Amino acid sequence: MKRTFQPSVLKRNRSHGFRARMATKNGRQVLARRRAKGRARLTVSK
Amino acid sequence: VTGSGKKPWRQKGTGRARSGSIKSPIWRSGGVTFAARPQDHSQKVNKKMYRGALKSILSELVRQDRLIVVEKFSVEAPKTKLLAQKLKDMALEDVLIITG
Amino acid sequence: AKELREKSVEELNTELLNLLREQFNLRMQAASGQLQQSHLLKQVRRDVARVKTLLNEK
Amino acid sequence: AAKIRRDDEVIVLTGKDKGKRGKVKNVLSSGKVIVEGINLVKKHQKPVPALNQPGGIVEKEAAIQVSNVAIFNAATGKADRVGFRFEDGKKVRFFKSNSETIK
Amino acid sequence: MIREERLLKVLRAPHVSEKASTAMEKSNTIVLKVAKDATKAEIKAAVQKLFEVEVEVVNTLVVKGKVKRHGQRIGRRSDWKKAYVTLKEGQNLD
Amino acid sequence: SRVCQVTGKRPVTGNNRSHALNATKRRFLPNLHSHRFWVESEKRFVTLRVSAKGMRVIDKKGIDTVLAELRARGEKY
RNA sequence: CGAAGGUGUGCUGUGAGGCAUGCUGGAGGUAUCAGAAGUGCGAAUGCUGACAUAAGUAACGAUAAAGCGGGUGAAAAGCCCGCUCGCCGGAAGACCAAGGGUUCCUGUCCAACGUUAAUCGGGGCAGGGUGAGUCGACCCCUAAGGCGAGGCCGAAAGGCG
RNA sequence: UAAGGUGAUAUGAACCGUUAUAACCGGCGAUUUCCGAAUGGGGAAACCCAGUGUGUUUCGACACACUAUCAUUAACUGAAUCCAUAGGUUAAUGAGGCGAACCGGGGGAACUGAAACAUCUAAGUACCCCGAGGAAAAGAAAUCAACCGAGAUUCCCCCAGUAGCGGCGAGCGAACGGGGAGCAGCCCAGAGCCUGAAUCAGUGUGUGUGUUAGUGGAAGCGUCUGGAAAGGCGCGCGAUACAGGGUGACAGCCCCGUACACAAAAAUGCACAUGCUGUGAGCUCGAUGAGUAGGGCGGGACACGUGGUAUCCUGUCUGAAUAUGGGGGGACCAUCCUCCAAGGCUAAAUACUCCUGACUGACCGAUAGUGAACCAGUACCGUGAGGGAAAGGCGAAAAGAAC
Ligand SMILES: [Mg+2]
Ligand SMILES: [Mg+2]
Ligand SMILES: [Mg+2]
Ligand SMILES: [Mg+2]
Ligand SMILES: [Mg+2]
Ligand SMILES: [Mg+2]
Ligand SMILES: [Mg+2]
Ligand SMILES: [Mg+2]
Ligand SMILES: [Mg+2]
Ligand SMILES: [Mg+2]
Ligand SMILES: [Mg+2]
Ligand SMILES: [Mg+2]
Ligand SMILES: [Mg+2]
Ligand SMILES: [Mg+2]
Ligand SMILES: [Mg+2]
Ligand SMILES: [Mg+2]
Ligand SMILES: [Mg+2]
Ligand SMILES: [Mg+2]
Ligand SMILES: [Mg+2]
Ligand SMILES: [Mg+2]
Ligand SMILES: [Mg+2]
Ligand SMILES: [Mg+2]
Ligand SMILES: [Mg+2]
Ligand SMILES: [Mg+2]
Ligand SMILES: [Mg+2]
Ligand SMILES: [Mg+2]
Ligand SMILES: [Mg+2]
Ligand SMILES: [Mg+2]
Ligand SMILES: [Mg+2]
Ligand SMILES: [Mg+2]
Ligand SMILES: [Mg+2]
Ligand SMILES: [Mg+2]
Ligand SMILES: [Mg+2]
Ligand SMILES: [Mg+2]
Ligand SMILES: [Mg+2]
Ligand SMILES: [Mg+2]
Ligand SMILES: [Mg+2]
Ligand SMILES: [Mg+2]
Ligand SMILES: [Mg+2]
Ligand SMILES: [Mg+2]
Ligand SMILES: [Mg+2]
Ligand SMILES: [Mg+2]
Ligand SMILES: [Mg+2]
Ligand SMILES: [Mg+2]
Ligand SMILES: [Mg+2]
Ligand SMILES: [Mg+2]
Ligand SMILES: [Mg+2]
Ligand SMILES: [Mg+2]
Ligand SMILES: [Mg+2]
Ligand SMILES: [Mg+2]
Ligand SMILES: [Mg+2]
Ligand SMILES: [Mg+2]
Ligand SMILES: [Mg+2]
Ligand SMILES: [Mg+2]
Ligand SMILES: [Mg+2]
Ligand SMILES: [Mg+2]
Fold it and tell me: Which residues are E68's β-sheet partners?
């Protein structure tokens, strides 16, 4: 079939990337809710 | 109990019991059903009741002679072996020395 | 350290000039099969460290 | 401030080798000192052909605690428990029993 | 011009391989494991001035290191640059 | 926004009561206009988002006094 | 000279129960009396961890097909070589952009992995292997569309431009 | 400060060092590539591309400094037009982001309970957003009181679940006044006076006392079992040290510390004295903060909710006396009492603990304690926000089994 995950790096870095988390002020709180619980995979940039 | 209020699974359907949380107080790593808070324990007893208790305790020590009376008892140097050997040759074992 | 502790910077110019090359010869013999001693590297690195310390002061 | 050091003649207080005498060889600050010829424990070396380690049994000394031994002063021939004092501007250790300054 | 601190700090080792010896013996080429921040206009300017060898071209690349499974730990080695550097005709380094 | 540039008025909320006194939220917007007001100490005009009350206020006091409180308040003219 | 815990053996009350010693066990524990209880379990298709039956039973994942002689090996149906047979040949042949990230080659090992055996491996370990003026990315310029100094408009967030 | 060290996983290697430059040790200055407010533009964050200037220059490339944006000040070239203004172009100072809790400003919700639900409750509760701080908000009479009075807010206990509010249903809930911690009052709305006069220190000093390393610091031996004394038996000893932990099992006197008493070259805090970058007290005169109190209209806060409702904040419309005066005293007048907004400031009593040091537990021992006693926000599962585990034990010392 045509399954759910169809992978693309140039879409993933623009959707769930760090510079995607950049401009949205409601996303700065998301980064500040991952740093302040201390995860290793902060965002899915590589 | 740190997690979230999400169910494990939906209620009806698969053949198990109606689970409710990952903080379930009958589960492993669950909660405690009647956990108690940081509290106090001091009761209150009266002025009259406390002084009556003191007058009650000041009687069997007389009737059993575990209270003894001495006028002067001290030492003239800050040294503990002097009181140790004073109690030694006074021949007492467990003393409560109340000064004036 | 007490030799270099007084020294002038014009000495340190030629001293660094030979010193980095002595570190390089030392490390290329650490690469090849002649150096069987394992302390001169740690010597020469702190040797460059102790003069790069004083190069700010003078 | 080391009450027992690396190059002294020391007596074992208690344990298996109580009362016996011997010299310390070298020292570890985890609370263990090598004292020579005291506790001969077994070891079974594995024979490797590298560096010519042929194996065989080796009876080696065992390390032992600093707080299980005390110094062996020939001025008493007994248990001397070292103290400290200052002479001539340096820490000099003396003997708290029989009052001999170690020099 | 290029300064002697970089000129001395840029090389790291000569490499050894069954692949390396063939380019040694056929084409008068050296096989250098170099640091990662090396450029072709600088490796040549180091080995020309220092070792007194006539050189013209450098063919860089990057070897990437593998993942080695240390029991219940996992680890991956480091980026290190290689360089196949062909010397001009008439020099043999010892 | 609604920068009432004389008196500083602001949309406050409140209620919308029914006649069974059922209530919902609302707003209370202030009256504004956009006046090209005429001043004498510079002999030209100046744009202003005055309120309804501020138009009474300005001709009561003066215009140079409004410039004086304004440029020291910080917000422009 | 042997405590808790475990284990058995007599013996004792109306019962919750109590008593000591045989064995393992190798540092701990309790009297009478009063004081605080996260205080007693079979059941909640309850929770987490281990073990049964069904049962050494159905299956071993394309009905394209294998047979024999030699090597290596502690034993070869599957490994290497040899030569008979078969199957695709607009694919199951020969390459790249996607995506994965040593799966690539060279020695060595068979414990888990492989739906069987297993010397073989895409498995474990170690060592080598990715060379550009011309070929792909940056690079000069844009399309949809994103941001957008000032600017306008929203309670702040901001919304457009 | 001292004979030991080159961190651990986890052992070999060339080693330093023994009477003081071996290393852990506290303070002081210097080193800190790139990403991130990222700030020279750009970007799919750890990548790419440039400029001006000072540099040398084996004509060959490198070194370093600089440069966003607005907030506010000066300049200089300053449009439609001559003066005027927008507007750029610099230079200087300031601001960006960061994280537990408490505070306080703009908004603002539901299941629920009423055994139904709509007024109401849940509640100004959860949550968004903004700000200044280690405190913040207030605060020094248009208060309260009954014709006796008390004299600002803040903050704890009462009067009390009472007089009120309420489909007078569910429930909401004060004050006057008393008892406590703490109590400090002040200057602006100036024409002329003393001339640098208290005041606050942001500062000049050092002291007291910390603080960031330290130092000394008491006092037992023989024997009975045991593999092992710390045990069992004797006779001792120190106690302004019987807090604890460790060493082959239960120790005051084997090790560290414990009582006590000292230590700082540098740097710093809190209380002090002293001219300081700027202080104007005190003293006579006065004036007494205008689109402002009020009123009408719809809401919200006051315990006040299809009211007899005081009072205060404002969206909108009209708005006077001004000390002879103006307000309030639970509608309203009359009579007395009390006090002067429209301009601000101010210590402590008050809350919380990501973070630092100690001490304590009728707290729990690996399904109990945070989720994590072990490399836990990890392997893993979800494209993403986000959710999230199982899992400790040889030994006295590994001496870990030569052959
Ligand atoms: Mg949900
Ligand atoms: Mg768990
Ligand atoms: Mg729990
Ligand atoms: Mg000891
Ligand atoms: Mg290349
Ligand atoms: Mg409503
Ligand atoms: Mg005015
Ligand atoms: Mg037995
Ligand atoms: Mg038992
Ligand atoms: Mg039992
Ligand atoms: Mg045991
Ligand atoms: Mg034990
Ligand atoms: Mg114990
Ligand atoms: Mg059970
Ligand atoms: Mg039952
Ligand atoms: Mg059940
Ligand atoms: Mg089964
Ligand atoms: Mg079975
Ligand atoms: Mg069968
Ligand atoms: Mg069958
Ligand atoms: Mg065959
Ligand atoms: Mg077959
Ligand atoms: Mg065919
Ligand atoms: Mg066909
Ligand atoms: Mg492989
Ligand atoms: Mg292989
Ligand atoms: Mg297998
Ligand atoms: Mg097999
Ligand atoms: Mg392969
Ligand atoms: Mg393999
Ligand atoms: Mg070429
Ligand atoms: Mg091309
Ligand atoms: Mg476009
Ligand atoms: Mg825009
Ligand atoms: Mg903008
Ligand atoms: Mg080490
Ligand atoms: Mg940048
Ligand atoms: Mg940028
Ligand atoms: Mg570009
Ligand atoms: Mg609702
Ligand atoms: Mg409802
Ligand atoms: Mg109801
Ligand atoms: Mg305040
Ligand atoms: Mg009065
Ligand atoms: Mg001590
Ligand atoms: Mg000490
Ligand atoms: Mg007035
Ligand atoms: Mg009004
Ligand atoms: Mg009215
Ligand atoms: Mg109205
Ligand atoms: Mg009023
Ligand atoms: Mg009245
Ligand atoms: Mg006032
Ligand atoms: Mg657990
Ligand atoms: Mg257990
Ligand atoms: Mg995954």
Answer: E75
Per-residue tokens: F55: 């138009």
Whole-angstrom CA distances from E86 to A6, D62, E14, E30, E90 are 46, 61, 14, 6, 11
| Helix F52-61 and helix F64-73, axial crossing angle in degrees, nearest 10 | 120
Q: How many domains does chain F have?
A: 1
The CATH number of the domain holding residue F75 is: 2.30.170.40
CA C9/CA C4 separation, integer angstroms: 10
Q: By what technique were these coordinates determined?
A: cryo-EM
CA dist D45 → D26, D38, D58, D59, F46 (Å)? 22, 20, 7, 10, 101
Strand H: which residues 5-64 of F lie within 7 A (CB)?
7, 9-15, 17, 19-23, 25, 28-31, 42, 44, 51-53, 56-57, 60-61
- Two tokens at D94? 């003396």
DSSP D68: G
Rounded distance between C-alpha atoms, residue A30 and residue D35, angstroms: 62
| Candidates 1.10.10.10, 3.40.190.10, 1.10.287.3980, 1.10.1040.50; CATH matching A1-46 | 1.10.287.3980
Q: How far apart are CA F50 and CA F4, in angstroms?
A: 5
How far is Cα of residue F3 from the mean position of the Cα atoms in its chain?
7
Decide the pairing of beta strands E80-87 and F16-17: unpaired
Could you state, in order of their start, the residue ranges of all structural domains in chain A?
A: 1-46
Containing domain of residue F23, as a range? 1-77
Q: How far is CA E2 from the centre of its chain?
A: 18
Q: How many CB pairs under 8 A join C and E?
A: 16
Contact E8 C31 (CB under 8 A): no
Q: Do E59 and E84 contact (CB within 8 A), yes or no?
A: yes
Give the resolution value in Å.
3.9
